[PDB]
RNA sequence: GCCAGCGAAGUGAGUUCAAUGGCUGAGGUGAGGUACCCCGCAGGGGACCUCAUAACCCAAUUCAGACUACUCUCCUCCGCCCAUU
RNA sequence: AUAGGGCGGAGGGAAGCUCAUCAGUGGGGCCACGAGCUGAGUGCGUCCUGUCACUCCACUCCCAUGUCCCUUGGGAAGGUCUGAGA
């Protein structure tokens, strides 16, 4: 039933309810996929220099990333560390995210099925440490 | 839309060169091109190792803005008055293939005609010092703008005199009114260690020359990349 | 009932910090009026007698914020590069350079000044490599984080 | 198609080389190497060796070294892991005319340990799951 | 010290600027009344001083030292006399207090907010909380034996092409179904309409022996359309009194309506109810957290043990069984477990969960707009994973207020709220929560959530929302605690951006069908014609010279005739809402690339392959096809409503492949001979004084739509706007497949979805990309 | 008649020592001229060039309504005077 | 009768030209996931051993810090008017 003709949506991956708080005192940056690289790096450069304009005050940032977004996140981070030109501390945190996929064909006898997957997420944490 | 590309006429010693490079990198520049004035009286050709920037500077110039590595070009400004000296420059089209942008400086109207007609140059230098009147014919200017010839206007009369300011502003207004203003870039020479101006100020200074409220900045920011591409296609 | 003002920032770039110490409002105003009177006539300089005025000045920093009108800021900003040969008690050669032209709006002009000051601090750090200035840099970063 | 890769774990490799761990490298893109490295991890869990596991990855494999080293953390249940992020220069020569190009790639290193980091962490702050 | 004094000077200048702008932005011209935030400004502070806070009132009194008739009637009787004409919902007065209320096809509803919040509604829709008022959904309750209602739904279902709702029976116990119903089973492609469907089977029978309920929820014009369909299909047989029901329904209650009849022959009991219960759609991730913190389950312990004096005996009769206490405990535990979940975004498809809730005005926090996140304690990860994997609320799906007599006994309580406001002030507590409980409101409510953009693979489950289902008595009382927590309210414009941002068509009338779409198009055309005759000439551009028959949204009825004539030479409104063929169209229109074999990836885990005869065989069984398309602007474009989608030529392909950043070519001008005819009509009119056509209306719709423009137009856009979900122009428009198959057969080469569009006010063509993600 | 406030992010423009209707070209409309093109009811339609597209005034939280200041502009009720049958 | 020419006054919840390029100020927007989490295929090893290599098979190419997009003072934005946003 999952081979002939079926509906395959990907629902969501849990991050936390942290990003309701994270853009207030610290800064958080989520890297999406296939949108733009240069726009993400420009928003990183804009949010990094923000003092009393960005959110409240730039003190520390950390960037979230999933399976390929970890690669685009390490790319924007290692280009931002070359671009911002200041001595900044970069520490990465590895975590496990549970992914749930749903599948169901359109038939009056079949039943839906849920597949489990595990993904590796990174948190790239940049501190403003004295040079 | 590559900004911060202008030309300089500056070589005295290594200390003044480092000072002008640091000043240009601090204020408003991301590509520095050094001209070398060669007149028709000396007729000297030293091309192999005259300058040696990378062996003497320290690994990077850093700017206050985008913090990008500056590309440094070595250009040659040849003052050509005699027609035989122009034939000497015709002989150098295959002998020594260096000095990416070749900049001729004409003084004869027939020589300026064959410069825009047959002679393979990149950017024609037009400066007027001490009573140099010069007319312009429109079809060679049309062939020049169809080809890609960007007209250089090197200015620095602001510290020395005021009559030189008068002759430069008169030549600039005549060029803007006759040439119609399609591809003309203005640049500064550096003999004294402080003969440089602002990066955004080039727009209003070409506005004082004329050409538009905006096409001075638009024309320099387009035609410098166009002139680098034209010199690259001439080299390759 | 109001008039749209324009403002401009200019940095004095020179060595020999006696030139950095030699600043005054009346002296700078008379200097700008005298160097516009050489470039422009009565119509250019007298419009600067009513519209142009000194607004913000720093001695050591060298950033000058000046006012200018709607129909005259092109003339003022075209008269700015021709400020040459300031004669004073010593033999000095100061010179202005434009950072960015802000269309009025003093608040974001002060916002852009803070980012420009942070760029002037952070870029100078790696090329010098000296701890005596680095301690004052750390104190300045700490005092900015206390704000 | 000849590539040379220069790495710019520089001060950190010293205390590890004092104890000689097992080194892991993931070049670009390879499938059965994940199973082979998990087999060596399962073997070295039983073999007599100190608590020090080193993972390294460059290029596109900077995602894959995040994945497989996660899986061992679901089995070995390690405590202190340092993830270091550095520049790596890849100078490769290829043919279309032979041309060489120098790219800059991220390089990701994972250091699993328990007792070597216990006097450590005033500065680095590794995660402690 | 050169560089040291420079460092101190730069630090002093940075400190001075950073303090100066921060003090000056909060100063606001040294005025205390302008120091307040701009969302919290009231202009009546000069008349009375109580419009400012007390700490600010102590300054405003010193600032004041420095510086029409009454209602003479019963206002309830005036509201009843006005409610005799209109509907006047319980929260309609709350909306009309601070929102624009415009009369519509049914009742008068909220179009736009009074305050400018168009960016703020999207910013509250992404991360924050936002709710709506959805009361127009009329409900058909059908009762009957298990074998007969399945036949009554099989006469209407069309499972073979549509989505499964009736005979599936596995999706029914956990969640609901949401799809489009059809007409009588002749299958003519005539009648269609979206209907949200609800099953419920009780846990104890487990066999076809008891009475099975089913619910239809739909739209009022759809109610007028489908009520006749059900009737033809199944069987052809002195104190203040608050008008909770509708006065149209209350006046028709003696002759006809609500429509609650039975059937002796087939045993089908039909209950058409216009306003029986209400539904509220709370959209937002933080909405789930504040719904956890505000809505709380009532305690079954203290009432169930010994507390019983005087009525609400039904809770005693329910709590008499020992299974109800453990059932309410499991419902409260699963509700707290849902509260432990960080978002309502991870949930399979529209789940249903109902429980008994102590009313959220018990707490009533003293502050206003007090929005907080969760505490950092986020434990119990195993039960969250168990609820996310299976998610089986069979036992917790409790139908208590769905009955005929119990819900009316709930509604008969007639609770007041101003007196309940006064009882809190009589207790004189400063900041504590104290509500006496000899008689509490221990009533159950339902939660049906909604995932949005499940079909679209661009965002994969964007719109996460909840639906609070509640009786008609408990209305605005449950509205206002969320408003005090800080939930924002959006009108029909917020539903329109919910449609166009999620790339779904609007369910009232923006999709074309025969009874609803045509009347809604004519109603919108009356407003556009009023704005057209309202504007004088020399302001608007003429559509004769530059464009074509725009923006009147019914020319495609003769466009598809020209397409089928062009097909056959060399039934109406057939919408291909069949998901298999839509995935086949997604396989061509989505990927536009060539690497080795297929689009965007060579393995693909799919079936790539070209056959044009199999594509032409689709048009033989499906005449006059019309499919909606999500189109995306690449660069340099802002779409308007009613943009016409034009087929690109080969020269446009060459000029776009030659150089990047290339704008579309201009449209040539057309002949306009009608101006002399309108001048002759004006001369004849002024002659006769001493067919009204002003500037581009005429009775020539047939020969033009065939061939007028230089390019071939095939597509009509209803919602053309730029979305902040992408950061460019993102439009949604209806096209025909007979023009798309020629586009797909014209280019086996590079980019194929790049198809131009033309707005009616402009002469510029702008290219976009076609996507069909269903 | 009296009685009811919320210090925390950021208005399909949101500034406050107070930004935002800038230039060019073609079409819209009010007009004039024709040595251009097509069709045969003296003519009709399209094409080319020029002029005019102003004033009132300027937002600081929004909306509804009322007011006052308008004339490139459109739908009507009209008046007076001049000329014709 | 020709509202042919000139002027004035009244009423309409009357409206106060658009588009594209170059350029100036300010604002907004730019969505954690390649079904590569024990991935697949090939050559030596191997059939129960890969500090082996290859294919950007998922093109994400490019010194990447914006050659990205949108719009931007109306009928009246003016009255020391009314009312509402409790």
Swiss-Prot record, chain A:
GO terms for biological process: rRNA processing; tRNA 5'-leader removal; tRNA processing. The keyword Nucleus applies. It comes from the Eukaryota. Signal peptide: none annotated. InterPro entries: Alba-like_dom_sf, Pop7/Rpp20. The keyword Cell inner membrane does not apply. Its main location: nucleus. One of its GO terms (molecular function) is RNA binding. One of its GO terms (cellular component) is nucleolus. Keywords: Cytoplasm, Nucleus, RNA-binding, rRNA processing, tRNA processing. It is found in: Nucleus, Nucleolus; Cytoplasm; Cytoplasmic granule. Component of nuclear RNase P and RNase MRP complexes. RNase P consists of a catalytic RNA moiety and 10 different protein chains; POP1, POP4, POP5, POP7, RPP14, RPP21, RPP25, RPP30, RPP38 and RPP40. Within the RNase P complex, POP1, POP7 and RPP25 form the 'finger' subcomplex, POP5, RPP14, RPP40 and homodimeric RPP30 form the 'palm' subcomplex, and RPP21, POP4 and RPP38 form the 'wrist' subcomplex. All subunits of the RNase P complex interact with the catalytic RNA. Several subunits of RNase P are also part of the RNase MRP complex. Belongs to the histone-like Alba family. Component of ribonuclease P, a ribonucleoprotein complex that generates mature tRNA molecules by cleaving their 5'-ends. Also a component of the MRP ribonuclease complex, which cleaves pre-rRNA sequences. This is Ribonuclease P protein subunit p20. It comes from Homo sapiens (Human).
Swiss-Prot record, chain B:
Gene3D superfamilies: Metal-dependent hydrolases. Its main location: nucleus. It is found in: Nucleus, Nucleolus. One of its GO terms (molecular function) is ribonuclease P RNA binding. GO terms for cellular component: multimeric ribonuclease P complex; nucleolar ribonuclease P complex; nucleoplasm; nucleus; ribonuclease MRP complex. SUPFAM superfamilies: PHP domain-like (SSF89550). GO terms for biological process: rRNA processing; tRNA 5'-leader removal; tRNA processing. Signal peptide: none annotated. InterPro entries: Pol/histidinol_Pase-like, RNase_P_p30. Component of ribonuclease P, a ribonucleoprotein complex that generates mature tRNA molecules by cleaving their 5'-ends. Also a component of the MRP ribonuclease complex, which cleaves pre-rRNA sequences. This is Ribonuclease P protein subunit p30. The gene is RPP30.
Curated annotation (Swiss-Prot), chain C:
The last C-terminal 19 amino acids are not required for complex association and RNase activity. Component of ribonuclease P, a protein complex that generates mature tRNA molecules by cleaving their 5'-ends. Also a component of the MRP ribonuclease complex, which cleaves pre-rRNA sequences. GO terms for biological process: rRNA processing; tRNA 5'-leader removal. This is Ribonuclease P/MRP protein subunit POP5. PANTHER family: POP5 HOMOLOG, RIBONUCLEASE P_MRP SUBUNIT (PTHR48414:SF1). It comes from the Eukaryota. Its main location: nucleus. GO terms for cellular component: multimeric ribonuclease P complex; nucleolar ribonuclease P complex; nucleolus; nucleoplasm; ribonuclease MRP complex. One of its GO terms (molecular function) is ribonuclease P activity. Belongs to the eukaryotic/archaeal RNase P protein component 2 family. The keyword Ribonucleoprotein does not apply. InterPro entries: Pop5/Rpp14/Rnp2-like, RNase_P/MRP_POP5, Rnp2-like_sf. Keywords: Nucleus, Phosphoprotein, RNA-binding, rRNA processing, tRNA processing. It is found in: Nucleus, Nucleolus. It comes from Homo sapiens (Human).
From Swiss-Prot, chain D:
Residues 1-8 have a biased composition (Basic and acidic residues). The keyword tRNA processing applies. One of its GO terms (molecular function) is RNA binding. GO terms for cellular component: centriolar satellite; multimeric ribonuclease P complex; nucleolus; nucleoplasm; ribonuclease MRP complex. It is found in: Nucleus, Nucleolus. Component of nuclear RNase P and RNase MRP ribonucleoproteins. RNase P consists of a catalytic RNA moiety and 10 different protein chains; POP1, POP4, POP5, POP7, RPP14, RPP21, RPP25, RPP30, RPP38 and RPP40. Within the RNase P complex, POP1, POP7 and RPP25 form the 'finger' subcomplex, POP5, RPP14, RPP40 and homodimeric RPP30 form the 'palm' subcomplex, and RPP21, POP4 and RPP38 form the 'wrist' subcomplex. All subunits of the RNase P complex interact with the catalytic RNA. Several subunits of RNase P are also part of the RNase MRP complex. Component of ribonuclease P, a ribonucleoprotein complex that generates mature tRNA molecules by cleaving their 5'-ends. Also a component of the MRP ribonuclease complex, which cleaves pre-rRNA sequences. Belongs to the histone-like Alba family. This is Ribonuclease P protein subunit p25. The gene is RPP25.
């Amino acid at each position: 039933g999952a081979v002939e003709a079926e509906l395959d949506p990907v629902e969501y991956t849990l991050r936390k309810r942290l990003p309701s708080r994270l853009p207030r005192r610290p800064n958080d940056i989520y890297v999406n996929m296939k949108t733009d690289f240069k726009a993400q790096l420009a928003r990183c450069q804009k949010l990094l220099d923000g003092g009393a304009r960005g959110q409240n005050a730039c003190s520390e940032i950390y960037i979230h990333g999933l399976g390929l977004a970890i690669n685009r996140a390490i790319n924007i981070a290692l280009q931002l560390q070359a671009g911002s030109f200041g001595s900044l501390q970069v520490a990465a945190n590895t975590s496990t995210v549970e992914l749930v996929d749903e599948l169901e064909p359109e038939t009056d006898t079949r039943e839906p099925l849920t597949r489990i997957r595990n993904n590796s997420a990174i948190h790239i944490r940049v501190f403003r440490v004295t040079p | 839309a590559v900004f911060a590309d202008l030309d300089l006429r500056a070589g005295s010693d290594l200390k003044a060169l480092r000072g002008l490079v640091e000043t240009a990198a601090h204020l408003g520049y991301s590509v520095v091109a050094i001209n070398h004035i060669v007149d028709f009286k000396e007729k000297k050709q030293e091309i192999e190792k005259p300058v040696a920037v990378s062996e003497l500077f320290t690994t990077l110039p850093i700017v206050q803005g985008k913090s990008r590595p500056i590309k440094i070009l070595t250009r040659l400004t040849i003052i050509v008055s005699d027609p035989s000296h122009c034939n000497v420059l015709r002989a150098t089209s295959s002998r020594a293939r260096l000095y990416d942008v070749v900049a001729v400086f004409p003084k004869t109207e027939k020589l300026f005609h064959i410069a825009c007609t047959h002679l393979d140059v990149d950017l024609v230098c037009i400066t007027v010092t001490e009573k140099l009147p010069f007319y312009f014919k429109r079809p060679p200017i049309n062939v020049a703008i169809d080809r890609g010839l960007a007209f250089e206007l090197v200015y620095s009369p602001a510290i020395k005199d005021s009559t030189m300011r008068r002759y430069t502003i008169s030549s600039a207004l005549n060029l803007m009114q006759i040439c119609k203003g399609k591809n003309v870039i203005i640049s500064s020479a550096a003999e004294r260690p402080l003969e440089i101006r602002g990066p955004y100020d080039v727009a209003n200074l070409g506005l004082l020359f004329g050409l538009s409220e905006s096409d001075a900045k638009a024309a320099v920011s387009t035609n410098c990349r166009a002139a680098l591409l034209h010199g690259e296609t001439r080299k390759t | 009932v109001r008039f749209k003002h324009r403002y401009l920032l200019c940095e004095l770039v020179s060595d020999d910090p006696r030139c950095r110490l030699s600043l005054d409002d009346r002296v700078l105003s008379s200097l700008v009026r005298d160097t516009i009177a050489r470039v422009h006539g009565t119509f250019g300089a007298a419009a600067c007698s009513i519209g142009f005025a000194v607004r913000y000045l720093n001695a050591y920093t060298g950033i000058v914020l000046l006012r200018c009108r709607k129909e005259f800021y092109q003339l003022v900003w075209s008269a700015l590069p021709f400020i040459t040969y300031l004669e004073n008690k010593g033999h000095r050669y100061p010179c202005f350079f434009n950072t960015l032209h802000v269309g009025g709006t003093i608040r974001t002009c002060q916002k852009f000044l803070i980012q420009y000051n942070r760029r002037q601090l952070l870029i100078l750090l790696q090329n010098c490599t000296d701890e005596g200035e680095r301690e004052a840099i750390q104190k300045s970063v700490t005092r900015s984080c206390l704000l | 198609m000849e590539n040379f890769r220069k790495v710019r774990g520089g001060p950190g490799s010293g205390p590890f080389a004092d104890l000689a761990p097992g080194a892991v490298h993931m070049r670009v893109k390879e499938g059965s190497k994940i199973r082979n490295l998990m087999a060596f991890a399962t073997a070295s869990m039983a073999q007599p060796a100190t608590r020090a596991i080193v993972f390294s990855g460059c290029g596109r494999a900077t995602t894959k070294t995040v994945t497989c080293a996660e899986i061992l953390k679901r089995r070995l249940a390690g405590l202190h892991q340092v993830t270091r992020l550095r520049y790596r220069s890849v100078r490769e020569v290829w043919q279309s005319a032979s041309l060489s190009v120098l790219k800059n790639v991220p390089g990701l290193a994972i250091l699993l340990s328990k007792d070597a980091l216990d006097p450590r962490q005033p500065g680095y702050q590794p995660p402690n799951p | 010290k050169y560089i040291t004094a420079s460092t101190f000077a730069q630090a002093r200048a940075a400190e001075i600027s950073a303090m100066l702008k921060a003090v000056t932005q909060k100063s606001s011209n040294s005025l205390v009344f302008q120091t307040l935030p701009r969302h919290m400004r009231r202009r009546a502070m000069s008349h009375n001083v109580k419009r400012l806070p007390r700490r600010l009132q102590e300054i405003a009194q010193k600032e004041a030292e420095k510086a029409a008739r009454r209602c003479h009637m019963n206002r309830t009787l005036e509201f009843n006399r006005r409610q005799k004409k209109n509907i006047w919902l319980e929260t309609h007065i709350w909306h009309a207090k601070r929102f624009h209320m415009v009369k519509k096809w049914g009742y008068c509803l909220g179009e736009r907010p009074t305050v400018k919040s168009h960016r703020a509604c999207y910013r509250a829709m992404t991360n924050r909380c936002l709710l709506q008022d959805l009361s127009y959904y009329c409900c058909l309750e059908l009762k009957g034996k298990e074998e007969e209602i399945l036949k009554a739904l099989s006469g209407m279902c069309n499972i073979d092409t549509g989505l499964t709702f009736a005979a599936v029976h596995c999706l029914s116990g956990k969640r609901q179904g949401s799809l489009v119903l059809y007409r009588v089973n002749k299958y003519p492609r005539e009648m269609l309409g979206p209907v949200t469907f609800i099953w419920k089977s009780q846990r104890t029978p487990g066999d076809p022996s008891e009475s099975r309920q089913l619910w239809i929820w739909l739209h009022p014009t759809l109610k007028q359309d489908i009520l006749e369909e059900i009737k033809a299909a199944c069987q052809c047989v002195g104190e203040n009194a608050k008008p909770i029901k509708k006065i149209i329904g209350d006046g028709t209650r003696d002759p006809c309506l609500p429509y609650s009849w039975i059937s002796p022959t087939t045993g089908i009991i039909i209950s058409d109810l216009t306003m029986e219960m209400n539904r509220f759609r709370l959209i937002g991730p933080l909405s789930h957290s504040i719904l956890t913190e505000a809505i709380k389950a009532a305690s079954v312990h203290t009432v169930g043990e010994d507390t019983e004096e005087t009525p609400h005996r039904w809770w005693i009769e329910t709590c008499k069984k020992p299974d109800s206490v453990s059932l309410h405990c499991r419902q409260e535990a699963i509700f707290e477990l849902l509260g432990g979940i960080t978002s309502p975004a991870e949930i399979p498809a529209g789940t249903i969960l109902g429980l008994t809730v102590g009313d959220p005005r018990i707490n009533l926090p003293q502050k206003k707009s007090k929005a907080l996140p969760n505490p950092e304690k986020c434990q119990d990860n195993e039960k969250v994973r168990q609820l996310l994997l299976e998610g089986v609320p069979v036992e917790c799906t409790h139908s208590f207020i769905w009955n005929q007599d119990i819900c009316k006994s709930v509604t008969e309580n007639k609770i007041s709220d101003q007196d309940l406001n006064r009882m809190r002030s009589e207790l004189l507590v400063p900041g504590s929560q104290l509500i006496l409980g000899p008689h509490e409101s221990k009533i159950p409510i339902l939660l049906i959530q909604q995932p949005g953009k499940v079909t679209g693979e661009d965002r994969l489950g964007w719109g996460s929302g909840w639906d609070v289902l509640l009786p008609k008595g408990w209305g605005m009382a449950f509205w206002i605690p969320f408003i005090y927590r800080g939930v924002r309210v959006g009108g029909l414009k917020e539903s329109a951006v919910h449609s166009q941002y999620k790339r779904s068509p609007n369910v009232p009338g923006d999709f074309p069908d025969c009874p609803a779409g045509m009347l809604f198009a004519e109603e919108q055309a009356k407003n556009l014609l009023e704005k057209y005759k309202r504007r004088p000439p020399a302001k608007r551009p003429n559509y004769v010279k530059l464009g074509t028959l725009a923006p009147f949204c019914c020319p495609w009825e003769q466009l598809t005739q020209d397409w089928e004539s062009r097909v056959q030479a060399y039934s109406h409104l057939c919408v291909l809402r069949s998901r298999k063929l839509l995935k086949q169209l997604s396989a061509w229109c989505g990927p536009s690339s060539e690497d080795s074999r297929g689009g965007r990836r060579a393995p693909g885990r799919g079936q790539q392959g070209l056959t044009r005869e199999a594509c032409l065989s689709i048009l033989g069984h499906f005449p006059r096809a019309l499919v909606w398309v999500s189109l995306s602007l690449l660069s340099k474009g802002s779409p308007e409503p009613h943009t016409m989608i034009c087929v690109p030529a080969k020269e446009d392909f060459l000029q776009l492949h030659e150089d990047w950043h290339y704008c579309g070519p201009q449209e040539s001008k057309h002949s306009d001979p009608f101006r002399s005819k309108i001048l002759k009509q004006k001369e004849k009119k002024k002659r006769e004084k001493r067919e009204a056509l002003t500037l581009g209306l005429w009775s020539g719709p047939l020969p033009r739509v065939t061939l007028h423009c230089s390019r071939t137009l095939l597509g009509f856009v209803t919602q053309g706007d730029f979305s902040m979900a992408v950061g460019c122009g993102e439009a949604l428009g209806f096209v025909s497949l007979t023009g798309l198959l020629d586009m797909l057969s014209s280019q086996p080469a590079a980019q194929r979805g790049l198809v131009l569009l033309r707005p009616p006010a402009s002469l510029q063509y702008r290219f976009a990309r076609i996507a069909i993600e269903v």
